[model samples]
Target: NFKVSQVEKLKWKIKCFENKFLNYRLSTNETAVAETEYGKVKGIKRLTVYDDSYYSFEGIPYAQPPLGELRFKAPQRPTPWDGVRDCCNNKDKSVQVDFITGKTCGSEDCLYLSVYTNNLAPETKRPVLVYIHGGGFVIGENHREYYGPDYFIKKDVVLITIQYRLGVLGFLSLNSEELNVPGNAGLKDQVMALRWIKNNCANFGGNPDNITVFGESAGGASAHYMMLTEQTRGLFHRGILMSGNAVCPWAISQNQHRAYAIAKLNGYKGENNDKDVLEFLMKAKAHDLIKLEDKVLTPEEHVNKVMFAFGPTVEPYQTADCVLPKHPREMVKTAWGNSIPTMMGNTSYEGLLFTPIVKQMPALLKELETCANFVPTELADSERSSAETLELGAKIKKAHVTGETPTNDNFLDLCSHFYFWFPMHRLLQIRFKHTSGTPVYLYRFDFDSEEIINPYRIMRHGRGVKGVSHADELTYLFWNALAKRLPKESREYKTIERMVGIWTQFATTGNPYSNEIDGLENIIWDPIKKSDEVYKCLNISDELKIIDVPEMEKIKQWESLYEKRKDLF
Candidate 1:
């Protein structure tokens, strides 16, 4: 078992340029005594066997806790402190959501950060990789098993995993109130964490200039999101977004209204009733929420149908005061949200995770009239004035899972394009059009999994051939047994070397191409442009290539949908 402890070697020194006597660490087996802005603060870390290839640090406070009037808002920088405040213990995220580790989190005061490094020599400059974990923007912390030292230390890079606010607290919108803006508090938390790293991460043996922000799923989405933000503009120059992109559900869909639902559930009503509202929620226990919400497919889904609500909105965001931005998307259009050098990717089977439910259309009709209040459109008036409703898209997405259309799996492909791929395309277009020195890359993962029946595998299939699932390709990055390890002679090994090399190299240099004359010519990471329009297809057993797609219509459909929802933008 891993028990966390701290070392307090309080010391101070002066930098060549500054008048300030900053905190400096005494040389230890794990850390070298270096001067920081706050005087002699040594990098004391908590280590365990699980942290084999690297050194680990927990509970490094990056910002002041968002308690009291700060809840549901942007983060604030802490005023420089005096003595060592102890970077020994863990800061468990208390009010987070998730079935597994989410329940184990700490509190609203969860603004701490964790750092892991590959045991480098006394003065080697290692490129830093700052990872932001993902769970639909509503549930996840830096301490998860996946975001561990073992993931990237093999490449000799520094890994820093961070936690942010989730659900209503992190993603809450205040466009309804005078103080609250439109989008997410969680996204704001991410921006602040990155800023802290840019301003203060070198003492931990990380290069402040060479940093990469990357992740999978929601983590991947956040990578894309950060690449698009002004607050995070120069915080990190490169990004690796695998199986996810920044075009999050709340940032793009009508789903952000869930902030109102959460506010209503807690009875805040979008007013200044935040204090009373937070206290009330802090006292409430977890319900059936965050469980396997199957009723999401019931006909009532259009109305009260499990109402699957979660994630950050592009509404409110980070500003000059470290406040979350107000109208994040608008900020992006104006090039204010433009960050840089990001590579975006997704698995071939993304839709299977949130498998569609066309067959549940009948079940959804039952709730249309009952939960008419939640629907955006008007309902038909019956003779008794009872509402009659229908679910247009409940089945639209389902067309993929049910295999209802096998015309090269048109429905399935369309859903995949609409929900996952097109967003990357739109983001590419946006970044390409607006930002400078920022090249956005696209990729599709097609590594088929061989896991058919494992007793230990807990997640279920959404629909279709539930095998080569979403986020499974990340096994390459995280070293999980979801797929079999490759032998040296095999083409798989070459692919792995190619992909991971491309990623790590990008973190070191802005370009993904290898330096040797013939080192990585066969590796397939290409740029996304208007002319050649190339992208990397991570074909597991096949050769990689870029092709024009048939999913253009889905992008058009979403464009119209977003056009209709222009007021929120």
Candidate 2:
């Protein structure tokens, strides 16, 4: 009887795939097609590891192409099409200076998104998962090569990935009395896409009310930013912020001067009025605008690792549609997004992403001589006096820095705490204090398998580097075509199953713990409670265990420094 049941299940799976394939072929004469609010869109069929198939709609325009007059402005809703639009392939990324090659690539007309779904019936209200890619607000796109939905499609959910404006085009703030070019066009692009998804996801068999917005690194920070603002109030339900948040030093930008710098670099000698600057930038080539980072960045900022030339900034002027009206620090103090369920975490060694830069730029090490250099950008950019900044920097150095000079071994820890770990901890603490009844899940991803390590980590730090580098968790979550496939029986494959399970479970129920999930069946992942002093977090490794948040001593040291300088940061 058991054997018969197994046979029946396998047959049912194959029949479902066949029916969808046949219907797609008969209708479009090629692949699957789905209806959107604007018009009909044709997509391709993709296979998951379980041999079941899903419909993939790539490069669907969520907003009108931001070009010419629309440059550096908020995105507009896409014009309705008369017929089915071919969304069979991925689209161009937003204009950016490629991080890996340091060369200019992509296009300005690039506000697009991709959707993957297992079912197309309106009654099948599966949970929807939207991912925002992270490349420091400079690079990255919604390409299948990096974030294939094969793994997530194995479970019952709809997956969506979006592309937004990047760099100067995305965040060039020139707010003056004459004109107001309030920045965060990149974030506004996300909001427009979310609105599009909420309206059209049900057509693709996703629950409009159960949307979960998640991202890693800069993308994670963007997700957190969405929660803080009122513009994205009803668009998304839960959030999964991995390895980054609003409090991270590089997440917010302080370089509004880059707008004028661009004008000067492009041979504009006009007065620095908002209208003049805006007019000059409007006519400037996209290539010239993205390549001005090196020209504008100060030596101190470069050495201090303030690498993001442009990112989400506080809107200098208030408008009805301001994405970020105030600084993130001030926004979090209020009850913003306090009732939204949140799952936030960071990799064990997020700083490893920047380890290669240390070797390339020796000036980074030389700058360590000044204890004041150790102060986080948030504090350093504040109105605090030099003496107070030096005092706090000394405390940080004493806690994290081991030697007179930062070696690769100790530099990893310093960068980890400075960039990713401490900021997340501080944000978690603040959110917990103000949280009403929403459960906040915190995690520390410590899984390190040589086979599935982030390829960038291996390229920069080599295979011998210890601990899981930044974005290492992404390897288990998404199917990367650049990396080799995982064997089904191996630990690497199991990690993929576990990660996808946790994420989809959260998307489905707003909680990650589930007995129905394979690897998480027996485990109990607890939410961080206000009563917990040290804070209990799920330590994800070979064995999932709930333990006191790691690196408490280092966190406490930073906390004490923040306590002393209460007004700053």
Candidate 3:
């Protein structure tokens, strides 16, 4: 009996030893490790429905924390790390107010990126997809609530999501030479992330040379801006913009008053000199600056046709700068040199999101008509007068409104085209016409997921042409728990599959239908080439059909105005 007890104790010790050895091997496995520019990181394996597992390296810092003295400065490269760091948790998002709750959440130390890939053996060079999120550039990050990786990772492609500075912290244009607070700090952060991927993604089975940068709304606008900026010249091979572009009025702020106003609200009593405001803002806490409520534009702004309170600025001409040398319209026509194949589109009713904010449509229209009388002081083009800008703005508004007065019912329609669809149409017209040797694909997202009722997805319940409002299509493309669930055979699921197929195909080969996935072969998505006099747009709905630009009469009305006053953009 004594000998038997000793044998049992020995067995228990052996069992414990075996478990420890297995765990040690698993912890040190090469499959879970990736070497980035800064150092090595250990990630966890996640199983997806495709009968495979993916490696998710979350919260990997691509740049040094832009906190304290680095608060308003452009992003800097990250320093090297020593051991294999476990990157299993998400990093802090740049200090920002939650768009929905209006509460502040996030941190100053939030310049990290998340990388998702299935294979790290580098057997073949898989394409890389870097997704920049959109929240009007004021609030958003690479959080799973806004984005996920499994949908794209299953296609043998690596997906990267990055967090950048937003609001005044990111785009405050002090234009100060003494204190280098250059505008578009967020844009610079994105370029830095791209540079990081280009240098290190190959280690994780991604073809760094075959990268595609894509996003929606503000992110989409940033993608277009990336094409124009010299800093991103070889960082990405292709670009896709969904429902946003650099040239959109809402996508950029023409003046720095918004920046100064926010500073004053936060107890900055200094003379509102650009340099003085910069110093005051730099000294304030990021949380206080982010929560300042003075940035929201009032109805008075509508009189000037003001849009986008905090956004990218056309930097003062410098011998050296990457923010923007000229207006996006001017750049594309004159010195626009990059020829990357591009895909850009807008949702059917993107302005649905704007409808809840604007209560009186006719009053807003009356205010917009006065836009012609304001002075044009923006740096993009000092030569273009306010009259031309307002004339163009009026023409744009007229194109959207079918009647003399914009009724509350048609408000969504008018704002949708004027703010979202029309701007994109104008951008594609210029991009396709001027981009040397590159082809551009245009599409309109009209597929509405009927079952969604999340408060965040407020546009799902819109009426009329508002069939598929802004971000409704994302329900099919990305995985979101907030959206109503669907089964494999469900129409929504099929839409998700097809959209994913087209997007990943474009990322892999600069064409959406390059390889012809199962249900897409019957669809012929011709590019919107300059030679093609009429716009051929892909109206993406329950069924995919290639059709002429949906609203020819309205689009041409804006086009005719743009033909003469193109500089107003």
Give the alpha-carbon lDDT of every model.
0.53, 0.78, 0.70
State the lDDT at 41 in candidate 1.
41
Deviation in angstroms for 88 in model 1?
5.7
Cα-based TM-score, every candidate: 0.70, 0.90, 0.85
Point out the higher-scoring one by TM-score: 2 or 3: 2
> Candidate 2, residue 511: CA error in Å?
0.8
lDDT at 334, model 2:
69
lDDT (Cα, 0-100) at 18 in candidate 1? 23
User: Ranking under lDDT, best-scoring first?
Assistant: 2, 3, 1
lDDT of 3 by residue, 134-182 (tens): 8778778886545767567667889888888888778876566666765
Model 2: weakest 10-residue lDDT segment is 1-10
Greater TM-score among 1 and 2 belongs to 2
- How do the residues 338-454 of candidate 2 rate in per-residue lDDT, one tens digit apiece? 677889888777777766677777566654545466677656655334787878777877876687765665666778888887887778777666546476898888888877544
Q: Which of the predicted structures, 1 or 2, would earn the higher lDDT when compared with the native?
A: 2
lDDT of 1 by residue, 148-257 (tens): 44446656677787988766556545444555545566777788788878876677677898998888767887776676666666677688877667554323333344
User: Candidate 1 or 3, higher TM-score?
Assistant: 3
Clashes of 1: 36
- Separate clash counts for every candidate: 36, 0, 0
